[PDB]
């Protein structure tokens, strides 16, 4: 059915030389941009340090975060997009549109 509320998923990976208060602090914050700009967080996944397939600014490892979240705004991928962008402590981005049945929960 034809609807405007969808379902994205995004993840994004931390540089390694932020303190684990700050990775988290990190995390909560993205959260907070994404609840900011009309989006409901629905899920969320620590996933630690994660050695790169290949380097990123001279880093071999990361610090990976995952959050699910709806929205009626259909800008804010682009907008979460641009944020984590520009935000030079998190060095990479990925923004998915998922099914509502690919919400997971716990
Ligand atoms: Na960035």
Same mark, same amino acid.
């Given at each position: 059915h034809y609807k405007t509320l969808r379902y994205y998923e995004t993840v994004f990976a931390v540089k390694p030389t932020l303190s684990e208060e700050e990775m988290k602090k990190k995390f909560e914050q993205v959260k907070?941009? /994404?609840? @900011?700009?009309?989006?409901? /967080?629905?899920?969320?996944?620590?996933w630690g340090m994660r050695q790169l397939a290949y380097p990123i @600014?001279?880093?071999?490892?990361?610090?990976?975060?995952?959050?699910?979240?709806?929205?009626?705004?259909? @800008?804010?991928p682009n907008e979460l997009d641009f944020q984590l962008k520009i935000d030079e402590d998190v060095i990479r981005w990925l923004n998915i549109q998922i099914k509502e049945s690919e919400v997971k929960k716990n």
């Open positions: 907070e941009f /994404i609840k @900011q700009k009309g989006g409901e /967080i629905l899920y969320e996944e620590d @600014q001279k880093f071999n490892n990361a610090r990976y975060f995952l959050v699910q979240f709806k929205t009626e705004n259909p @800008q804010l």
